[PDB]
Amino acid sequence: PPPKLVLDLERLAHVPQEKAGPLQRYAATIQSQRGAYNGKVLSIRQDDLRTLAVIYDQSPSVLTEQLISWGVLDADAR
């Protein structure tokens, strides 16, 4: 059972939008589809990580490492 993929929306909003752009919009799209827009965090699907990976032309694991270093993802997602 893969550990949760919980995004820190606060920190994600603060990362240079030249790198976090696509991730920010992806997260906003989920908030829209869910109808839930207010919240400090946002848990996303394992599928989304694999989708995001492609967007960034990286392995899911390597994208995870980057997200962790941005503080957007907790170290608990390994």
Side-chain angles (χ1 to χ4, degrees):
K4 296 299 178 188
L5 292 175
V6 184
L7 302 172
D8 195 318
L9 301 171
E10 171 181 304
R11 204 160 291 154
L12 174 56
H14 289 149
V15 182
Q17 310 119 16
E18 8 134 73
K19 313 312 175 188
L23 176 55
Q24 288 172 329
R25 298 188 291 276
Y26 195 105
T29 299
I30 295 183
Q31 288 181 309
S32 312
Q33 297 169 326
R34 291 192 187 179
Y37 307 92
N38 72 89
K40 279 180 169 53
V41 292
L42 186 71
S43 51
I44 66 185
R45 303 178 179 179
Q46 294 301 327
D47 283 337
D48 299 329
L49 175 56
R50 290 177 286 257
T51 296
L52 282 158
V54 175
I55 294 184
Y56 285 93
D57 189 17
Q58 302 269 310
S59 173
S61 63
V62 173
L63 180 57
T64 294
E65 294 297 318
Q66 301 171 222
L67 297 193
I68 293 170
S69 72
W70 295 353
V72 164
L73 263 178
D74 200 282
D76 295 334
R78 282 196 173 96

